[PDB]
Ligand binder design. Sequence first.
Ligand code: MG
Ligand code: MG
Ligand code: MG
Ligand code: MG
Length: 41
Amino acid sequence: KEMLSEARARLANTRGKKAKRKAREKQLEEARRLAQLQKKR
RNA sequence: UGCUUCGGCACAACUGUUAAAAUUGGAAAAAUACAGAGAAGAUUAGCAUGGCCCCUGCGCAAGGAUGACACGCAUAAAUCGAGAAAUGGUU
Ligand SMILES: [Mg+2]
Ligand SMILES: [Mg+2]
Ligand SMILES: [Mg+2]
Ligand SMILES: [Mg+2]
């Protein structure tokens, strides 16, 4: 079963990791922008 | 200073980016914290390509993580007509 699950994952995956950083990083930046706008308010 | 009919002539001819400043602004770096690496399973050699990306180098070398980046994540609708049927107006 661990072999079959390793197989299933490795047969599905074509991505890389930093795309995950991507959206999260943009959200972080957006949050920072919102905080700055609030400070300006 | 010559020459002087001693009256005067002659010669010589325009420095300074002008600051001992004043601002004035833009800069690399440092720490901090962030976060922290190609290829397809993993681990790994690279050589490229493109340019409003550079750095080191005397460089038409070589290197910088294959220097980096890009590299697609294609929520890139790459999109629509054929026909029967059937229903709607009008006679
Ligand atoms: Mg190369
Ligand atoms: Mg090189
Ligand atoms: Mg190496
Ligand atoms: Mg390169």
